[PDB]
Structures are given as C-alpha cells and as structure tokens.
C-alpha cells in the first residue's frame, strides 16, 4: 500500500501546471527519497539473500515508475524551450501511459505470483 500510494503521488505531478518548475521537481525528488526509504525497510524485513524476491521486484518497479515520472518532467521542461507542442502533448500522453502501465504491471505481477 505505501509503495503504490507513493507511485500515485508521483502521478499527481502530470496534472500540475508545467510552468511551476520547483513544485514538480520537488514532488518527483521527494517521491524518490520516500521510495528509497521504503525499499530499505521492506528489504530489511528478511535475511540478506542475493537473489530477487517477489517483494523487491515490486519495489524496484515502483522505483522505476517514480524515476520515470521525474525524468519525464525534466524532458518536458527541456522541450518547452525547443518545441512547445511537443511538451504540451507529452504531458497528456504521460498522464495516460503511466497509470495504464502500472495497472498492467500489477495484473501481470499478481497473476504470475498468486497462481504459482
């Protein structure tokens, strides 16, 4: 629950006005630090095994999602100066491609692991 809630919090950035740079930057980076703290705790639950468990695959995918949101904002802001239409449509495209990808990953993950 905390990891997915952090992921949706990262999504929230896609609706913030593209002009407010400090707001969205801080949103993304704070999401990242919260993600790393959560990963540390979750892995600290169990012994130090070198292989990948189902829990830390989930946490790693959540971290990738938050990182994707932050880098996406960075690229959008960079393209503002070059091409306005590119960034304008990029925001809306991300708004849909992020939640759909997360729902799809959830479906795959839970189907594979619960039915095993």
């Amino acid at each position: 629950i905390p990891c997915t809630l952090i992921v949706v919090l990262s999504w929230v950035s896609f609706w913030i006005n593209k002009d407010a740079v400090p707001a969205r930057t801080s949103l993304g980076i704070t999401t990242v630090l919260t993600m790393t703290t959560l990963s540390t705790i979750a892995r600290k639950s169990l012994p130090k095994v070198s292989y990948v468990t189902a829990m830390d695959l989930f946490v790693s995918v959540c971290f990738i999602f938050v990182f994707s949101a932050l880098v996406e904002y960075g690229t959008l802001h960079y393209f503002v100066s070059s091409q306005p239409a590119r960034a304008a449509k990029m925001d809306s495209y991300a708004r849909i491609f992020f939640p759909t990808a997360f729902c799809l990953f959830n479906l795959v993950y839970w189907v594979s692991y619960l039915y095993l």
Partner: protein, 52 residues
C-alpha cells in the same frame, strides 16, 4: 546520499579504514556535490556573461 550512507553505516562495525562501498558512496557524494557547485558557479557568473 546522506540517508543512504546513514542506513548503511548502522549494520557494520566501526573500523578505522575505508571500505570499497564507503569509497563508492564517497565518489557518488562528491559527484552530487560537484553538480550543486556547478549550479552555484553558473548562477554566480550568469549576470555577467549569458553565453559562458
């Protein structure tokens, strides 16, 4: 970087020398610090030369 180092140092004992992981964390810190100093330099000198 500070909090990652903090969480790491808890597990190990207190040894006088630097471990490979400690040297890696130092390097990553120094790179982040240098990026911050790069922005500091850019901001200091921008008002004079916008091209520099």
């Amino acid at each position: 970087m500070t909090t990652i180092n903090t969480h790491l140092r808890e597990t190990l004992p207190k040894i006088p020398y630097v471990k490979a992981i400690d040297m890696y964390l130092m390097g990553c810190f120094v790179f982040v610090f240098m990026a911050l100093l790069e922005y500091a330099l850019v901001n200091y000198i921008f008002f004079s030369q916008p091209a520099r």
